[PDB]
Amino acid sequence: SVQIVYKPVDLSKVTSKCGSLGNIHHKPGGGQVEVKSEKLDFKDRVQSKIGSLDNITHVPGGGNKKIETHKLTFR
Amino acid sequence: SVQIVYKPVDLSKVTSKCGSLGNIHHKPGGGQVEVKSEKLDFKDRVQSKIGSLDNITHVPGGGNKKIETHKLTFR
Amino acid sequence: SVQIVYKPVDLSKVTSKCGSLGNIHHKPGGGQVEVKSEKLDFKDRVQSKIGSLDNITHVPGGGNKKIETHKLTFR
Amino acid sequence: SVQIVYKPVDLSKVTSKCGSLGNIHHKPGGGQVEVKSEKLDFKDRVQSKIGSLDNITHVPGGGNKKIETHKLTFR
Amino acid sequence: SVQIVYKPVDLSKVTSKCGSLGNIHHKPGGGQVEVKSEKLDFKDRVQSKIGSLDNITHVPGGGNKKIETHKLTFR
Amino acid sequence: SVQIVYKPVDLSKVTSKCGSLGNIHHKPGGGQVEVKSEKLDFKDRVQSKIGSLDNITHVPGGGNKKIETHKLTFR
Ligand SMILES: Nc1c(F)ccc2cnc(-n3ccc4ccncc43)cc12
Ligand SMILES: Nc1c(F)ccc2cnc(-n3ccc4ccncc43)cc12
Numbered sequence: 368s369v370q371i372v373y374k375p376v377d378l379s380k381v382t383s384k385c386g387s388l389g390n391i392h393h394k395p396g397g398g399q400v401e402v403k404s405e406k407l408d409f410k411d412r413v414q415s416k417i418g419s420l421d422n423i424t425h426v427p428g429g430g431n432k433k434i435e436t437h438k439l440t441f442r
Numbered sequence: 443s444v445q446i447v448y449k450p451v452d453l454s455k456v457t458s459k460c461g462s463l464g465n466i467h468h469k470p471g472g473g474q475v476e477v478k479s480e481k482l483d484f485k486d487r488v489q490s491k492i493g494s495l496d497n498i499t500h501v502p503g504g505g506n507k508k509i510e511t512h513k514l515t516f517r
Numbered sequence: 518s519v520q521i522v523y524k525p526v527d528l529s530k531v532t533s534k535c536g537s538l539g540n541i542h543h544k545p546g547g548g549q550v551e552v553k554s555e556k557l558d559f560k561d562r563v564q565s566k567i568g569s570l571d572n573i574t575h576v577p578g579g580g581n582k583k584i585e586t587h588k589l590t591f592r
Numbered sequence: 593s594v595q596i597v598y599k600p601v602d603l604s605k606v607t608s609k610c611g612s613l614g615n616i617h618h619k620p621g622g623g624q625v626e627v628k629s630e631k632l633d634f635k636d637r638v639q640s641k642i643g644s645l646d647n648i649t650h651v652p653g654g655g656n657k658k659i660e661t662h663k664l665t666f667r
Numbered sequence: 668s669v670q671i672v673y674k675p676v677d678l679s680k681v682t683s684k685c686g687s688l689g690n691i692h693h694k695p696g697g698g699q700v701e702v703k704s705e706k707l708d709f710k711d712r713v714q715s716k717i718g719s720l721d722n723i724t725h726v727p728g729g730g731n732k733k734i735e736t737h738k739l740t741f742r
Numbered sequence: 743s744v745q746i747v748y749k750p751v752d753l754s755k756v757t758s759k760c761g762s763l764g765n766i767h768h769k770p771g772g773g774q775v776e777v778k779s780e781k782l783d784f785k786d787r788v789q790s791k792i793g794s795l796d797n798i799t800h801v802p803g804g805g806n807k808k809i810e811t812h813k814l815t816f817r
């Protein structure tokens with residue numbers, strides 16, 4: 368006989384407080400990018416960037432993350 | 443005989459407070475990008491960027507994330 | 518005999534408060550992009566960008582995310 | 593009695609030969625300029641440029657110059 | 668009694684030959700410029716540039732110069 | 743008695759020959775400039791540049807110069 372009981376209990380807090388958030392300046396001075404390739408072959412589950420001059424300002428008021436995997440395998 | 447009981451309990455909080463959010467300046471000075479290729483072959487589940495000059499200002503008032511995966515496999 | 522009971526309980530909060538959100542300036546100074554290719558072959562589930570000069574201002578008042586996957590497989 | 597005999601002689605050549613002139617690429621990636629002032633006071637014979645993002649391609653087939661000043665002053 | 672005789676003789680050559688002129692690439696990656704002032708006072712014979720991001724391609728087939736002054740002063 | 747005889751003689755050559763001129767690449771990677779001032783006072787015969795991010799490609803097929811001052815003063 369097999370009995371499997373899977374009862375995780377989660378009471379977690381992920382939390383932040385900020386009084387104020389601001390006066391943020393992102394002022395990048397350009398630039399130059401060159402890429403040479405011949406053949407690209409991309410297959411299962413690829414994340415790729417080639418030849419980029421990207422500027423990102425990311426200012427979340429919270430920006431909190433919780434990541435949670437439950438896996439049960441029986442054979 | 444097999445009994446499998448799967449009862450995860452989740453009371454999670456992902457939370458934030460901000461009193462004010464602002465005064466954000468994103469002012470990029472241009473730039474230059476060149477890419478050369480001959481052949482691109484992309485198959486299953488490819489995320490790709492080639493030859494980009496992208497500017498992003500992302501300012502969510504919260505921007506909080508919960509990611510929660512439940513997998514039960516019986517063979 | 519097999520009994521499988523799958524009863525996840527979820528009371529999750531994903532939440533945010535912002536008193537004010539604003540005074541955001543996105544002012545990009547142009548730029549230049551060149552891409553050369555000969556052949557593009559894209560098959561299942563491809564997300565692709567080629568030769569881009571994109572400006573994005575994304576300011577959600579919340580922008581909170583919950584992603585929740587339940588998979589039960591019986592073979 | 594005073595005699596002034598001002599007789600300059602000039603058989604100068606300013607000259608060029610070019611067999612072919614070309615394949616010229618001027619390809620600038622943008623940029624960003626900011627100038628702050630409160631007061632400008634410009635008087636006689638002022639040449640001024642303030643806050644400029646200027647692109648010039650100048651390709652004369654000759655572009656040769658002769659500058660020649662003659663000045664006789666008597667008091 | 669005074670005699671002034673002023674007879675410069677000029678047979679000068681300023682000269683060039685080029686068989687071909689070309690394949691010139693001017694390709695600048697942007698940039699960022701900021702200038703702060705309060706008061707500018709410019710008087711006689713001022714040549715001025717303030718806050719500039721200038722790109723120049725100058726390709727004269729000759730571009731030869733002769734500059735020449737002939738001053739006679741009698742008091 | 744005064745006799746002043748001014749007879750300069752000039753037979754000179756300034757000269758160049760080039761078989762071919764080319765394959766020139768000027769490719770600058772941007773950059774950043776900040777200047778702070780309060781008062782500028784400019785008077786007779788001033789040549790000035792303040793806060794610049796300038797790119798110059800200068801390719802004369804000749805580019806030869808002759809500068810020539812003749813001056814005579816009498817009292
Ligand atoms: N999620 C993505 C794709 F689907 C494809 C290409 C990517 C390239 N880059 C990032 N990336 C994230 C954070 C970071 C920081 C610095 N550089 C790069 C970064 C994420 C990608
Ligand atoms: N979600 C996406 C696609 F479907 C295809 C291409 C992508 C390229 N890039 C990102 N990416 C995310 C964050 C980050 C940060 C820096 N660079 C790159 C980034 C995401 C992509």
Ligand SMILES: Nc1c(F)ccc2cnc(-n3ccc4ccncc43)cc12
Pocket residue numbers: 490491496498564565566
């Ligand atoms: N969802 C998409 C498509 F269906 C196809 C192409 C894409 C390229 N890019 C992004 N992307 C997202 C975030 C980010 C950040 C930076 N660069 C790139 C990004 C998303 C894409």
Ligand SMILES: Nc1c(F)ccc2cnc(-n3ccc4ccncc43)cc12
Pocket residue numbers: 639640641715716721723
């Ligand atoms: N002739 C002019 C005016 F009447 C007033 C302003 C000027 C500003 N600049 C130039 N100038 C010439 C060549 C060069 C090269 C680089 N930067 C600047 C230049 C000339 C002007």
Ligand SMILES: Nc1c(F)ccc2cnc(-n3ccc4ccncc43)cc12
Pocket residue numbers: 639640641714715716790791796798
């Ligand atoms: N002729 C002019 C004006 F009437 C007023 C401003 C000027 C600023 N600059 C130049 N200039 C010439 C050659 C060079 C090279 C580099 N930087 C600057 C230059 C010339 C000017």
Ligand SMILES: Nc1c(F)ccc2cnc(-n3ccc4ccncc43)cc12
Pocket residue numbers: 714715716789790791
């Ligand atoms: N002719 C000019 C003006 F009337 C006013 C400003 C100037 C600033 N700069 C130059 N200049 C020439 C050659 C060089 C090389 C490097 N830097 C600077 C240069 C020339 C000017």
